[PDB]
Symmetry: D2
Subunit: 425 residues, 4 copies
């Protein structure tokens, strides 16, 4: 019942392959607070990696889950259906952007969601290839590791992942890749490796998560939409991390001015319970033949009621607006800290999907991974849990529950400021 | 509040890709009883497809879940660890067959488990190919669909799944495939398509589930073990369906007289909550570098305490001995019915993983898919939930909770018996 | 000069990868005779591996070549056409089996022939997968090595060859593979790994060459044709080695009672000059868009007139009939030797595609690669060039020119006869 | 005996997939002269696509061919070796750039050469992936089509080519790709799709042929060599078209200041006879196990003595020097014509590997293909045979034999000048 003892036991029973960002064993939690086995208290700015937008154990969510535990926990929908699954699908068909008839499939993880969205796109187009972007992250199954634009550590040592996945450039002006280069990198694929007629879908994160919290602009997204229409390519928006309200709208695509053919959701959608899904143009969704979709746990009853309560909470507690206000308050505080620390070369984010990127002496081509990691460690020592991300591990992101208290906003910003001041000593 | 009303809403909100064995919407359940939204009661012989060996909402399991629901439901282990995960791993390391040290990785679904088992074998052997068997089922992600020995419906319209997966024959004398043919088929692969030094693993189900409840014999499994040993090939045992006590021992491999290098488990391990995992040789498990294993929901807290409680229940309530007793009563009962119906050409099963196979006029070359389907439908009319399986859809399997009461064992057999008699005239 | 001296320079300037069956350097050859640099004379029963059906430098062929040599040796057909290429295609379109219009593509090597045949079937059916047989040999390019049913040493050390090539069993009663087993193995692929809708072609050798001179039966070929017809799959007959008269008919398929959709030809077609090609159902051949088929040396001028002359020589000199006569004399001579050597467990062959298989003590389960190799080495010391084959290197094949005189036939057989007697002493 | 009639015959016997640049049937030729079946004469500025650097039927080469034709034309080296093959390998071990021991493999086509070079690199490094450049061209086999950086028409309609071939950007300032962009595009592959440890080789054309006659600079080639050295990746130089003295030196790599690990050669190596090969670092060439390399026609006797004679002709006639002077006279004349026609936006080339690129209104962003095509057709009408190329087909290239006469260089330039003036009237 000590963090160190538990870490020792871990090294004996669990593979080192499962990294451990923080050597801490959480015991209990509530909203933005977490207590370890030693009773220490921490402020959670990671949110279980964008999974806790309604916070740890939201009362409404927990009450719903407890009620469902009195009825049943599993039947396997495809064997014996149940209402929570159907209801969520109906609601997602409406909530997901796209002014047309849609259908929803529930699965269990973000990885499976992307897996099924691609299987569906292939069935609908009768094509086999897919295009993803540099720095993308879509999961850890063989195929999603291929879609993921990061070999190390996700696929390191395992040999080459499935082929017929082509790499396009994600637009990122901060690093010299115009939206023109991005659109041009897709045409390069068409001309050099896979003609449009062999590409079932173009998979993209409206805002890259693990990739650095880089957001696609509406104009770029609009150009991509047009490129897919022109070629009959399904546009797949992976919103496992950008969805569930993190950006100010339930789904980031709503702010792009265009609708994808398929959308995946997970993480925060159920506020702490295993659930994910795929919503898309009905005709596309129906392309797969009966019996070709499913999974044992898919749309687990408890997770479904949890998701339904999360949606009601976003409405009841005005969480979308709070995401926006929270984001502005965070960037303002971050911009202040930056006026005193050159290493911070960028402060960005839609809604509450906030991040800052660190460069050596503000040199926009000198990723400061060491400083980034130093801040994470300092924040832990001050009781703050943070996550870094980005292909160069020089991006600090904030994923604190949207239900955060005013005081905790000040507390996190303060601690962060202290970290940059104590590191510069 | 009407099964048919709900089915209608289902067809407008959910893709046809998701099949529906029984057009019934469950509302609540307890042990082996399920009640639909109309209040009609059914006896559950499908168990959410082998996920409810401890029955629906086993009270010990639910109380554990309730206690944990008071502490936390999610942190993402890689970010902040927690005891239920660590603790289940230790238990699994001890329980899965193998006299060597093992390490366990917790994920969320059976597909993920197979996916990770293979990634681990690839990293450990530094090889890329894998071998699976005919009629096998390992999941619905691109790669596991490739391992799965069945294209339709799981892959129709989609195109070809990931390559570098070679097919071997599962031993099945009942249908002409001898143990010698099985083994010969692996050497044929070594000789024709992929040398031993390019095969990371041979994935096999000790007892094929979707494949028809065909069990491997200890003798075959031993030849297979020796063959893997000789080539440094990892033997992966997929015990998602055969595991968690279904066959009379916690894992089917315990009755094979040999131990695999890796074992994947799921479904019944958590008795109704989303969880799966991989347990294998520690040094093999540790071949993946830190950061190469993970997943957002992996080893969800709630599901972890559920699995821990399930294992305690197997001990306290003697479920393994009950499995063996249940299987004998079922097989005795089914053999009785077979005396009056020649169509029943085989009654088989280890422990409680019981199945009967139907043939037109007892002709072992004429699988009766029509009769099989009819029995399933007649049973539903009598209040019994059944599932069929096998590549020819002529196998009826029984996956009723091991916690079933004696009277319910008779009720089910009697119903099954009436279904056959009534299928005659 | 010295054979050994040349072998030494060889080991210094050429990689060990290029094996050397006979450590002999040829200087001159004519018809069935070869003289090495040491002036020693050899009777050639290998024919450059089935490339010299009209013998070394057939005078008619040489005269045609010399005449063309005065005109031009290369222009690259795609840039400037030339009659020899056009004229050969026209003749092949009519002589290749198939009661329908055909078109012919000329390439340079048997490997390229197969490569293009598969590319054309893929473009015509719009499918990507192919099926090949156990023990098959189709070339040494990445893709043809995948089709080739033998990994060592062709693919050894290189890793896995291209995917989406599935393995069926070649019918071979001698070793336990019945025609039913072979056809069942194709359905197995359809059910387990690749649906018919995803298979562009089934590649087969009417008579396997490197595989062991195992011939397909008309009945089997007919079942395969019906199976292909039923699923829209192209039947590709690789006749690089069985073609050009070796079996008694210009192409082996003529003796099968059915026509393939595509046929690849090579080796003896040009009697000792670099040339290969693909003749097939015209609309299939035309499925590829202009600019899609090509190659620099494709249908080389000198090699085309040689091929046109080889065809005339076959008519004028009655070689098809002679192949049958030659084959009968060889099989009789070999069966007489077999009456004294039990190790000879089989004497088989269509036309002059003759082979004998050696077994230890005469046990079909004990391939005698050692005796086989001894016969080859002894025969060479006696002035007879032989080649072995088969997956277990226990097959002696006879590929001697069809233009051989009766005396060389008696002579070659005596030499072979003595080798067996001296090997037992 | 009419071009039109032969073309009509062609449409009925040969597939449309084989495009016909010029609808002319050549009857005979000599050095740089070609006569069609109608007796019309042409000045060949295409050389059978860089295959006739020593011109059509060079008398010395023809005499060597004739002498060998009296000895033998084929035995299949790996069966019965022969001196011509051994001697050419010895010479290429010296001639190919690289101050260190080398070994040589002889195959038959430029495609097989690239196929074997990769096979060799994979065995040497024990890795499966490869990297090629945009606009590259390496052959028409499945695998070389994957390496080739152009889908249509080379591999269009056929589906997706073999995976595990990744795309980098070829340096090309003219179109905005800096050397840094090229090098960085390689790092992008290492981070996003295939770690260095999985890349067996990087394949590059010192000067892209079909790609538009774009040459790599010494500086870039040096960075590419350092990058390879650091990761253990084999650098494969494909000199099928750039080699055989086209650039002023025998091989273009000689002018790069660095040596590749493997080099492929073909086309002009044998002045118009089928031959190709791979020369590389001995230890690397030897990585393949014995028997792993081969080919029926490989290093054909007649093509070998032709290649040997071609190398002698280069030394005797000083063709390397003439290449440089030819290139200069060509550039000067083209720069002249360029002054009156702004459409000619670039005049480039190493040695005699000369090309000009056309732009609509000199606007480098508007690749003028229609004008390029017009020039080719006008030139044909004026008796000059030309070829275009480049990803946008706006590149005119000159591959006229190096043995061309001074008076014909003027004649050729005059015809081109007239074409531009007239196309602009
Ligand atoms: C955009 C995105 N897509 C997919 C996934 C995979 O989801 P899971 O971990 O639930 O399998 C993640 C997880 N961080 C993600 O951020
Ligand atoms: C042997 C086996 N392996 C893997 C799976 C896949 O598990 P999941 O559906 O939880 O993804 C199943 C599911 N019926 C199975 O029976
Ligand atoms: C049936 C078959 N197919 C293809 C090939 C390959 O031909 P090549 O060596 O000319 O590339 C051979 C050569 N022995 C063959 O026998
Ligand atoms: C650089 C290059 N590599 C490979 C090849 C393929 O050679 P082949 O046409 O002889 O098969 C070519 C032919 N245009 C080429 O230019």
């Amino acid at each position: 019942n000590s963090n160190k003892e538990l870490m020792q036991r871990r090294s004996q029973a669990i593979p080192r392959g499962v990294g451990q960002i923080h050597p801490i064993f959480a015991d209990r939690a509530e909203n933005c607070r977490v207590w370890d086995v030693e009773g220490r208290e921490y402020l959670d700015f990671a949110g279980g990696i964008a999974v806790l937008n309604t916070g740890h154990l939201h009362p409404k969510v927990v009450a719903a889950v407890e009620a469902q535990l009195k009825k049943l926990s599993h039947t396997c929908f495809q064997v014996l259906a149940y209402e929570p699954y159907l209801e969520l699908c109906e609601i997602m068909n409406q909530k997901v952007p796209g002014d047309f008839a849609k259908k929803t499939l529930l699965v269990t993880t973000g990885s499976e969601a992307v897996e099924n969205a691609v299987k569906i796109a292939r069935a609908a187009t009768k094509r086999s290839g897919t295009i993803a972007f540099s720095g993308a992250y879509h999961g850890r199954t063989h195929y999603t590791l291929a879609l993921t634009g990061k070999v190390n550590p996700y696929s390191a040592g395992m040999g080459l992942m499935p082929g017929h996945v082509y790499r396009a450039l994600y637009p990122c002006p901060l690093h010299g890749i115009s939206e023109d280069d991005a659109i041009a990198s897709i045409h390069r694929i068409f001309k050099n490796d896979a003609a449009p007629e062999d590409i079932a879908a173009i998979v993209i994160e409206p805002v890259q998560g693990e990739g650095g919290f880089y957001a696609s602009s509406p104009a770029f997204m609009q150009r991509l939409r047009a490129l897919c229409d022109e070629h009959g390519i399904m546009l797949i928006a992976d919103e496992a991390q950008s969805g569930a309200g993190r950006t100010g709208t339930l789904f980031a695509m709503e702010q792009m001015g265009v609708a994808p053919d398929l959308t995946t959701f997970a993480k925060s959608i159920a506020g702490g319970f295993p659930l994910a899904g795929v919503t898309g143009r009905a005709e596309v969704m129906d392309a797969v033949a009966p019996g070709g979709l499913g999974g044992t746990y898919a749309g687990n009853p408890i997770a479904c009621v949890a998701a339904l309560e999360v949606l009601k909470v976003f409405e009841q507690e005005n969480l979308l607006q709070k995401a926006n206000d929270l984001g502005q308050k965070l960037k303002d505080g971050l911009l202040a800290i930056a006026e005193k620390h050159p290493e911070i070369g960028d402060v960005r984010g839609l809604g509450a999907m906030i991040a800052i990127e660190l460069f050596e002496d503000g040199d926009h081509n000198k990723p400061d991974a060491k400083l980034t990691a130093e801040i994470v460690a300092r924040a832990r020592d001050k009781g703050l849990i943070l996550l870094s991300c980005g292909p160069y591990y020089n991006v600090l992101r904030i994923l604190v529950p949207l239900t955060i208290e005013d005081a905790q906003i000040r507390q996190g910003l303060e601690i962060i400021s202290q970290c940059f001041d104590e590191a510069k000593q």
